[model samples]
Target: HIAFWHNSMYGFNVTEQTFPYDNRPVVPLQYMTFQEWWFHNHLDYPPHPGDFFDFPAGKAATAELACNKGATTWFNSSEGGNIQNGNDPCPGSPPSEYHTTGIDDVKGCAMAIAYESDVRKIKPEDFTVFSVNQTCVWYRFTDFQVPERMPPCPPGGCHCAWFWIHSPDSGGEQIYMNGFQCNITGSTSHVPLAKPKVARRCGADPDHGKPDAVPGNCTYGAKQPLYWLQKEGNNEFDDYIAPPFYNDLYNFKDGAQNDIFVDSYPDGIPLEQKLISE
Candidate 1:
C-alpha cells in the first residue's frame, strides 16, 4: 500500500508500505535502471523544440508518437533555427494565427508521411511486449506548463520548456540531479546530475554532536522506520529490512531545516525485517 509522510521542512512525501489485506492493485514496482530513468527524467520530455519534427501539434503529440513507436526525437540544431517558433514559416503571423490554409495542410501531410514511414520501420510487436513485460519502465512522469508575462530569454525571442527529475529506486532512494530543458532558440543540452549525493534519512542529525560510541548517532536520529522479524527458537533465521533512502531532499533551498535523508542503509546485525507468519 501507499502511505504519505509529512514534514513541515519537507514539501510532500510518499512511501511504500505493506497492507493489512491483499487488496492492493497489481502495479509495476520494480526498480528501473539508473541510465534509463535518468534519460527519461531529464532528456525525454525536453523543451518545446525537442519535438520540432512534430511542430504545430506541440510536444505532447510528438511525445505520444515517440512512445508508441519506441523511439526518441532527434534534431540538428545547426540546420534548423528555432523550429518551435510558430511563426518560423511566417515571421509576423504565428502558425496558430496564420491566414493560409494550404501551409498547415501541407505541414500535416508531411508529418503524416514521416510518421508512417518512421513507425513502419519500428518493431511494434517487440516494443509492445517489452513495455508490458518490464516490471518497471521510465516514462514522462509529470509535467507543468506556465505562461509568463516576461520572456524567458532576451527581447525579440520566445521561451518554452519543461524541467524533470529521475524516479527513485523501489525503496524510494532519492536520485540526485538537477532539472533540465530545451528552449525555442535552438539551444539544446542537458544538466548533469548533482554531486556529493544528498542524504535520505529524514529527521536524522548529520552532526552527531554529542560524544558517544557513534558520533552522529546523538544528533541525527534514525530517519526511516526500522523493524525486525524473528522466527521462534531460530535466532539465525531472523531477517532485517527497511526502505532504501533517496536523496530527494537535496533540492531544498534551506539546508538546515531539510532533514530528509537519502541513500541511507543500516549496518551490523539485521536491525529490521518484515515477514509473513507461517
Candidate 2:
C-alpha cells in the first residue's frame, strides 16, 4: 500500500519531546517513516511543468553550481589546456588547423587523457544504443503567426518550422531512430502538440490553409512542451566507442549523426527494496 507524510496534520508529533517545545529529532531522520521524511524533504521542492519523465533541471548551471563536484572537476580538467590561450573549453569542433602526430604534444596529450578518462567512467553494460537517419528533409507551418505582431511567414514558411533526425546503431548497422521539431526560440524548450498530418509525410504546403486544416497547421498550440532531443547516455557511459577509423571525418558535421545509442533498466522494483532486502 502507498503512504504519505501529512506534515500539516501531524506537525512534528513523532518527535522526541511533546507539546509546544517538542522538536523533530534529527538522529532518526533517515529511518523515519517514508511519508514523514518525504514530507520534510520535498514539501517546498515540488516539480515543475517542464519536469517530464526525462530531463530534470530547469536552468543550465555550472557542474559545481549544480552540486555535481565530479562533473565540475571533469569540465575544469578538460578545459585546462585552454589556459595558455586565455579561453574556456567551449563545445563543438576543434580548430581546423590543429594536428596530432604524437602523444608528446601538450594539446594532443590533454585531449587523450580527457577521452580516456571519459571511457573509463562509462561501462558497456549500462546502456542500450539506438540510431536514426534524416536526410534532405524540412517542415512547413501555414498560418503561423508569432504571439505578437510579426512579419509574414518566411517563404514557404520554412523559417517557421525546423526538423532534426537521429539514428541508432545496432551491431554496426545504422537504423532510423527518432525525429524532432526544432523550436525557433533559442532555448531548448518545445511546444507539445500533435504533429500536422502533412508535415509528417513531408508534403506540407504553406499556402494551402483549408478550413479543416487550419487548426493543426502549426505547433504553436501544443499542450505539452519538451526540449531539444539531447542525446542520452552520452554524458556518463564509456561503452560507446565511436568507430576509430571514421572518427576524424564523421566528427565534423552540422546535424545529429546517425547510429545513436541509449541505456535503460527495469522499473518494477519497490522503492524500499534496497533497505528491506539488506
Candidate 3:
C-alpha cells in the first residue's frame, strides 16, 4: 500500500474530515481486468492546479513515501508542513513491506513519462522510463535525478507514472503503479526523446544466458517501464522469487537516466547548428 507522495495527483486529502486510507492494491495484480489494470485501481482523480510532481533537470527531486496518509500531511488537512512520521523519524512509520534478501541489493523504482498531457489519450507503449531510484520505498523519502538533456513537455505537461515491483519474501508477488502530471524543469534541449524499445531481461553472459550478476552491459538506450505479473503484462516474469525492477535486470541506472537520448541523436546533431538556431 506504499506510494510516493510528493505533490502527486492524489497526494493529499483536500477535505478536512476525509480519511486517506491506503488505496494501493495487491490482489489486483494476480487477477486484474483491463480497466483495473489501466486505471491503477481506478484512482483517476485529477490533480489540483500546479500540484503535479516536478523533476528539475540535472538536479535531484525527492518524494515523500508512506503506507498511510495519516502519517503524512493529510493528518492535518488545514496546515501544510506535516509529513509522514514527521521529517526526521521513520521508526514509528508504517513499513513498506518491501524487503531484500541481501543488505546491499535493494529493489528499485522508476519514474516513467509519456509525452501526451491527457491520461486518457496515452497508451501503455507510449510511456518511457526516464529516471530510476535504486534505493527507494525502504526509506521515508526517495530521490531521483532528472536527465540533464530531457526535452520540454507539451503545453499541458506530461503524463507521469511511478512503478515498483517489490520482493515476494515479505508479501505476495505484486506490481504497483500510480499516475500524476509531471514536467521537466530547466530543460534546454529541444530534440524529442528517442522512440523507446521494449527492454529485454539480459543476462551476464551474452552467448550462454546467465543471470546478470553485475550492472550495465544489458539493455541500453531508451526503454519502456516493465508492465509485469498480470494478465496482460508486457513482461511475463513467471518466477515469483525474481521480480522485475528498475535496476541491473533492465540496465536502468541508479540516479538520473542519462541514456534515454542516447539513440535520439545517432546522426550526431551539430552543437554549432543548435547554438545558431537558439
Candidate 4:
C-alpha cells in the first residue's frame, strides 16, 4: 500500500525558492555547476577537478552512496505507509504535510553538503545550514526508491522516485529513533558515527519537526534510468531550459558514456539563463 501526497509546487518553481545567494550566483538548475550546487547546498569548499557532485550530508529525501556520514534516508517509500498497517496515519499536520517528495524530479532537501576530493573528510562542521532556531536535522529513515513493476514506473510512466512522510510523534507510538529508519522501526541501543549530536534542529523545514526526528529506517537506491530520458533528450540535442539535466545518475544511454558532465553538457552557458534567487 505504498502512497504519496505530492505538494503543490511544480518542478519549475523549486529552482525559484528564496536563497540568500549574495555570494553564490545562480547556475542553470538543469545543468548544475559545482559552484551552483555548492551554493544551493550552502557550501564553501574550494573546487577540485574530481569533485563530481557529492551530497556528503545525504539529502532530506535520500543521498547517493557515500553521501553523508549517517544512514541514507528520505521520504518513507515503503510498500505499506497507510495508518491501517500498524503505523499511525501519516502527513496530516500543519507543516509535516508540507515536507514531501518529487520536487524537480528531486524529492528531498539537504541541510549540509560538500564536493570533497575525499568523501570521508566531510565533517559535521562542514555544514552551514541551521533552522531559523540555529540547528539542522537528519532523518534516520530510508527505502524510498521506486519499486520494480509498479504502475508509476518503467515501460510506461515517468517512474520518478516515489515516497511519503510521517507526522511527528503522534502519541509516543512513534518513538523509534537512534538508528531506526521508520515510524514502524526504532533502536533504543544503537549509536551512529556522530551519535546524533550535531546541532539540535537547525533551519528547519515546515514539514519536518525536529532536526533529530528519525522518520523510519528504510533503504533507497537507483536500479535504472528514467523512462523520459528519450523524451527528455537522452540522445538528441536538448533544449537549453530542459533535458540534459545533470545528476549523480547517468542518462538514458549505456554505461557512463552518456554522463551529463562528461558527454552532454557543453562548456558554454545558456544565453537566457536566469537566477530565481539572489
Q: After superposition, which runs of candidate 1 have C-alpha atoms over 4 Å from their true positions? A: 1-29, 41-45, 49-195, 200-241, 244-278
Candidate scoring better on lDDT of 1 and 2: 1
RMSD of each: 21.7, 22.6, 7.3, 20.8
Q: Write the per-residue lDDT of candidate 3 for residues 59-158, one digit (tens) a residue.
A: 9887665655455554354243444554421335334344444435457888888998777888888888988888776655678888888989999888
Clashes of 3: 1
- Give each model's whole-structure lDDT: 0.19, 0.18, 0.65, 0.20
Best by lDDT: 3
- How do the predictions measure up, each by TM-score? 0.20, 0.15, 0.78, 0.19
Model 3 poorest ten-residue lDDT run: 19-28
Candidates in descending TM-score order: 3, 1, 4, 2
TM-score, predicted candidate 3 vs. hidden true structure: 0.78
Clash count, one per candidate: 19, 18, 1, 20
Best by TM-score: 3
Candidate 2 residue lDDT tens string, 56-173:
1122111111111111222232222222211212113232111212222211000000001122232212211111111111111001112211112112111011111111122221
- Alpha-carbon lDDT of model 1: 0.19
- Candidates sorted by lDDT, best first: 3, 4, 1, 2
Q: Give the CA lDDT, 0 to 100, for residue 176 in model 1.
A: 20
